[PDB]
Amino acid sequence: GAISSVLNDILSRLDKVEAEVQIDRLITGRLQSLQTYVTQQLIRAAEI
Amino acid sequence: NATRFASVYAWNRKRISNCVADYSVLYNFAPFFAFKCYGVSPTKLNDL
Amino acid sequence: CFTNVYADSFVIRGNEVSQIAPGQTGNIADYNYKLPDDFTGCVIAWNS
């Protein structure tokens, strides 16, 4: 739901107080993407 | 460099696009006094 | 309670009060009195 997926564009087209909300969306989403991958790899590891 | 400007109840609007608004070479050509900018400073118009 | 308290006091044009907020843009907040983008405190203003 951020203005872009390109973090360099959020950092170019906004600044500090307005930017850091639009970046914290990408922190939340990316982190969810990693934690989903690691949870699937733990479950495959238990199968292998 | 127009021959005359418009009657202000029926002012003249032109759309400026697909071009470089190089400020110094045209604003040095005709003498003028006021450069009252709002929201952006005069010097930063060179690379914004 | 407060561990230290520091009253800053100065005069501006009522047009400038919106720039005394953290991280904004405009000549007072750019060249005269710039507070932290993360400051803790209160901004107070009135006409005189």
PDB file of C-alpha atoms in Angstrom:
ATOM      1  CA  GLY A   1       0.000   0.000   0.000  1.00  0.00           C
ATOM      2  CA  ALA A   2       2.986   2.399  -0.214  1.00  0.00           C
ATOM      3  CA  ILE A   3       3.422   4.974  -3.062  1.00  0.00           C
ATOM      4  CA  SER A   4       6.052   2.604  -4.610  1.00  0.00           C
ATOM      5  CA  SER A   5       7.979  -0.632  -4.138  1.00  0.00           C
ATOM      6  CA  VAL A   6      11.195   1.273  -5.059  1.00  0.00           C
ATOM      7  CA  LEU A   7      12.539   2.531  -1.743  1.00  0.00           C
ATOM      8  CA  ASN A   8      14.923   5.014  -3.489  1.00  0.00           C
ATOM      9  CA  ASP A   9      11.786   6.681  -5.048  1.00  0.00           C
ATOM     10  CA  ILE A  10      10.083   6.963  -1.597  1.00  0.00           C
ATOM     11  CA  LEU A  11      13.374   8.529  -0.374  1.00  0.00           C
ATOM     12  CA  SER A  12      13.508  10.888  -3.402  1.00  0.00           C
ATOM     13  CA  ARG A  13       9.805  11.886  -3.543  1.00  0.00           C
ATOM     14  CA  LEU A  14       9.273  12.350   0.233  1.00  0.00           C
ATOM     15  CA  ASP A  15      11.369  13.321   3.264  1.00  0.00           C
ATOM     16  CA  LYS A  16      11.759  12.260   6.981  1.00  0.00           C
ATOM     17  CA  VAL A  17       8.363  12.696   8.746  1.00  0.00           C
ATOM     18  CA  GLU A  18       6.217  11.973   5.648  1.00  0.00           C
ATOM     19  CA  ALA A  19       8.626   9.400   4.193  1.00  0.00           C
ATOM     20  CA  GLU A  20       9.143   7.185   7.282  1.00  0.00           C
ATOM     21  CA  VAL A  21       5.431   6.021   7.287  1.00  0.00           C
ATOM     22  CA  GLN A  22       5.652   5.038   3.559  1.00  0.00           C
ATOM     23  CA  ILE A  23       8.953   3.147   4.282  1.00  0.00           C
ATOM     24  CA  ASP A  24       7.558   1.373   7.435  1.00  0.00           C
ATOM     25  CA  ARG A  25       4.961  -0.278   5.128  1.00  0.00           C
ATOM     26  CA  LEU A  26       7.823  -1.856   3.103  1.00  0.00           C
ATOM     27  CA  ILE A  27       9.606  -2.850   6.420  1.00  0.00           C
ATOM     28  CA  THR A  28       6.411  -4.568   7.636  1.00  0.00           C
ATOM     29  CA  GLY A  29       5.704  -6.302   4.287  1.00  0.00           C
ATOM     30  CA  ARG A  30       9.267  -7.361   3.474  1.00  0.00           C
ATOM     31  CA  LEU A  31       9.766  -8.729   6.991  1.00  0.00           C
ATOM     32  CA  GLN A  32       6.453 -10.672   6.616  1.00  0.00           C
ATOM     33  CA  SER A  33       7.789 -12.103   3.308  1.00  0.00           C
ATOM     34  CA  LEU A  34      11.009 -13.302   4.936  1.00  0.00           C
ATOM     35  CA  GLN A  35       9.274 -14.713   8.025  1.00  0.00           C
ATOM     36  CA  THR A  36       6.888 -16.648   5.701  1.00  0.00           C
ATOM     37  CA  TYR A  37       9.836 -18.086   3.694  1.00  0.00           C
ATOM     38  CA  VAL A  38      11.707 -19.167   6.880  1.00  0.00           C
ATOM     39  CA  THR A  39       8.519 -20.756   8.351  1.00  0.00           C
ATOM     40  CA  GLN A  40       8.077 -22.785   5.107  1.00  0.00           C
ATOM     41  CA  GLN A  41      11.765 -23.767   5.100  1.00  0.00           C
ATOM     42  CA  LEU A  42      11.593 -24.998   8.738  1.00  0.00           C
ATOM     43  CA  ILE A  43       8.595 -27.142   7.733  1.00  0.00           C
ATOM     44  CA  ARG A  44      10.361 -28.504   4.668  1.00  0.00           C
ATOM     45  CA  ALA A  45      13.467 -29.130   6.788  1.00  0.00           C
ATOM     46  CA  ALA A  46      11.359 -31.226   9.165  1.00  0.00           C
ATOM     47  CA  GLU A  47      10.165 -33.282   6.111  1.00  0.00           C
ATOM     48  CA  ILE A  48      13.646 -33.716   4.550  1.00  0.00           C
TER      49      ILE A  48
ATOM     50  CA  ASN B   1       8.724  39.500 -25.271  1.00  0.00           C
ATOM     51  CA  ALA B   2       4.987  39.915 -26.242  1.00  0.00           C
ATOM     52  CA  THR B   3       3.908  43.185 -27.968  1.00  0.00           C
ATOM     53  CA  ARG B   4       1.277  43.804 -25.186  1.00  0.00           C
ATOM     54  CA  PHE B   5      -0.101  41.679 -22.273  1.00  0.00           C
ATOM     55  CA  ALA B   6      -3.824  40.782 -21.646  1.00  0.00           C
ATOM     56  CA  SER B   7      -6.823  42.632 -20.114  1.00  0.00           C
ATOM     57  CA  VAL B   8      -6.880  41.108 -16.570  1.00  0.00           C
ATOM     58  CA  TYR B   9     -10.655  40.110 -16.500  1.00  0.00           C
ATOM     59  CA  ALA B  10      -9.735  37.887 -19.458  1.00  0.00           C
ATOM     60  CA  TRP B  11      -6.059  37.015 -18.697  1.00  0.00           C
ATOM     61  CA  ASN B  12      -3.723  34.958 -20.981  1.00  0.00           C
ATOM     62  CA  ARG B  13      -2.743  31.384 -20.012  1.00  0.00           C
ATOM     63  CA  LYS B  14      -0.183  29.295 -21.981  1.00  0.00           C
ATOM     64  CA  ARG B  15       0.781  25.656 -21.223  1.00  0.00           C
ATOM     65  CA  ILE B  16       4.560  25.084 -20.821  1.00  0.00           C
ATOM     66  CA  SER B  17       5.730  21.419 -21.299  1.00  0.00           C
ATOM     67  CA  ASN B  18       8.217  19.066 -23.008  1.00  0.00           C
ATOM     68  CA  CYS B  19      10.972  21.734 -22.706  1.00  0.00           C
ATOM     69  CA  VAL B  20      13.653  23.339 -20.364  1.00  0.00           C
ATOM     70  CA  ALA B  21      12.465  26.460 -18.448  1.00  0.00           C
ATOM     71  CA  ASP B  22      16.051  27.936 -18.286  1.00  0.00           C
ATOM     72  CA  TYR B  23      15.308  30.942 -16.033  1.00  0.00           C
ATOM     73  CA  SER B  24      18.495  33.128 -16.137  1.00  0.00           C
ATOM     74  CA  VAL B  25      18.880  33.496 -19.980  1.00  0.00           C
ATOM     75  CA  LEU B  26      15.270  34.840 -20.420  1.00  0.00           C
ATOM     76  CA  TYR B  27      14.895  36.788 -17.083  1.00  0.00           C
ATOM     77  CA  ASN B  28      18.281  38.565 -17.701  1.00  0.00           C
ATOM     78  CA  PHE B  29      17.027  39.616 -21.254  1.00  0.00           C
ATOM     79  CA  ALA B  30      14.035  41.748 -20.081  1.00  0.00           C
ATOM     80  CA  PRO B  31      14.653  44.080 -17.021  1.00  0.00           C
ATOM     81  CA  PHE B  32      12.414  43.288 -14.021  1.00  0.00           C
ATOM     82  CA  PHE B  33      12.258  43.914 -10.199  1.00  0.00           C
ATOM     83  CA  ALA B  34      10.094  41.325  -8.356  1.00  0.00           C
ATOM     84  CA  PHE B  35      10.812  37.553  -8.207  1.00  0.00           C
ATOM     85  CA  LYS B  36       8.378  36.695  -5.365  1.00  0.00           C
ATOM     86  CA  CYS B  37       8.420  32.878  -5.125  1.00  0.00           C
ATOM     87  CA  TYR B  38       6.031  30.866  -2.923  1.00  0.00           C
ATOM     88  CA  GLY B  39       6.857  27.364  -1.648  1.00  0.00           C
ATOM     89  CA  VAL B  40      10.204  27.000  -3.589  1.00  0.00           C
ATOM     90  CA  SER B  41      13.288  29.279  -3.327  1.00  0.00           C
ATOM     91  CA  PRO B  42      14.643  31.173  -6.413  1.00  0.00           C
ATOM     92  CA  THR B  43      18.121  29.462  -6.538  1.00  0.00           C
ATOM     93  CA  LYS B  44      16.789  25.851  -6.376  1.00  0.00           C
ATOM     94  CA  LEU B  45      14.753  26.303  -9.642  1.00  0.00           C
ATOM     95  CA  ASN B  46      18.074  25.391 -11.474  1.00  0.00           C
ATOM     96  CA  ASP B  47      17.845  21.598 -10.725  1.00  0.00           C
ATOM     97  CA  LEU B  48      14.357  20.851  -9.180  1.00  0.00           C
TER      98      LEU B  48
ATOM     99  CA  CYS C   1       8.341  16.374  35.191  1.00  0.00           C
ATOM    100  CA  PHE C   2      11.124  17.590  32.834  1.00  0.00           C
ATOM    101  CA  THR C   3      14.874  16.956  33.156  1.00  0.00           C
ATOM    102  CA  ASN C   4      15.751  20.213  31.458  1.00  0.00           C
ATOM    103  CA  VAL C   5      13.506  22.884  29.917  1.00  0.00           C
ATOM    104  CA  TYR C   6      14.598  25.459  27.330  1.00  0.00           C
ATOM    105  CA  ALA C   7      12.296  28.330  26.237  1.00  0.00           C
ATOM    106  CA  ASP C   8      13.282  29.660  22.820  1.00  0.00           C
ATOM    107  CA  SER C   9      11.609  32.994  21.949  1.00  0.00           C
ATOM    108  CA  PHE C  10      11.591  35.032  18.702  1.00  0.00           C
ATOM    109  CA  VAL C  11       9.338  36.939  16.245  1.00  0.00           C
ATOM    110  CA  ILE C  12       8.164  35.740  12.780  1.00  0.00           C
ATOM    111  CA  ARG C  13       5.463  36.623  10.248  1.00  0.00           C
ATOM    112  CA  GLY C  14       2.181  34.672  10.916  1.00  0.00           C
ATOM    113  CA  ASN C  15       2.814  33.138   7.448  1.00  0.00           C
ATOM    114  CA  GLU C  16       5.821  31.241   8.957  1.00  0.00           C
ATOM    115  CA  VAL C  17       4.203  29.368  11.969  1.00  0.00           C
ATOM    116  CA  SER C  18       3.563  26.264   9.752  1.00  0.00           C
ATOM    117  CA  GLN C  19       7.347  26.000   9.078  1.00  0.00           C
ATOM    118  CA  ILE C  20       8.252  25.866  12.861  1.00  0.00           C
ATOM    119  CA  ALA C  21       7.016  22.219  12.880  1.00  0.00           C
ATOM    120  CA  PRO C  22       9.750  19.450  12.716  1.00  0.00           C
ATOM    121  CA  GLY C  23      11.405  18.736   9.335  1.00  0.00           C
ATOM    122  CA  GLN C  24       9.470  21.374   7.241  1.00  0.00           C
ATOM    123  CA  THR C  25      10.846  23.650   4.425  1.00  0.00           C
ATOM    124  CA  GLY C  26      10.984  27.508   4.363  1.00  0.00           C
ATOM    125  CA  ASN C  27      13.574  30.249   5.046  1.00  0.00           C
ATOM    126  CA  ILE C  28      13.074  30.630   8.870  1.00  0.00           C
ATOM    127  CA  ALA C  29      13.152  26.838   9.409  1.00  0.00           C
ATOM    128  CA  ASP C  30      16.050  26.560   6.831  1.00  0.00           C
ATOM    129  CA  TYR C  31      18.406  29.377   7.952  1.00  0.00           C
ATOM    130  CA  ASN C  32      17.304  30.923  11.313  1.00  0.00           C
ATOM    131  CA  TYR C  33      15.632  28.474  13.739  1.00  0.00           C
ATOM    132  CA  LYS C  34      15.694  24.788  12.784  1.00  0.00           C
ATOM    133  CA  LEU C  35      14.512  22.345  15.490  1.00  0.00           C
ATOM    134  CA  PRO C  36      15.177  18.532  15.393  1.00  0.00           C
ATOM    135  CA  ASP C  37      13.086  16.338  13.069  1.00  0.00           C
ATOM    136  CA  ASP C  38      12.440  14.238  16.241  1.00  0.00           C
ATOM    137  CA  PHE C  39      12.221  17.021  18.910  1.00  0.00           C
ATOM    138  CA  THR C  40      10.120  16.714  22.086  1.00  0.00           C
ATOM    139  CA  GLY C  41       8.361  19.923  23.225  1.00  0.00           C
ATOM    140  CA  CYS C  42       5.596  22.413  22.333  1.00  0.00           C
ATOM    141  CA  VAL C  43       5.391  25.299  19.770  1.00  0.00           C
ATOM    142  CA  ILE C  44       3.297  28.326  20.955  1.00  0.00           C
ATOM    143  CA  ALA C  45       2.367  31.449  18.910  1.00  0.00           C
ATOM    144  CA  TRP C  46       0.199  34.566  19.049  1.00  0.00           C
ATOM    145  CA  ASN C  47      -0.170  37.900  17.170  1.00  0.00           C
ATOM    146  CA  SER C  48       1.422  41.004  18.798  1.00  0.00           C
TER     147      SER C  48
END
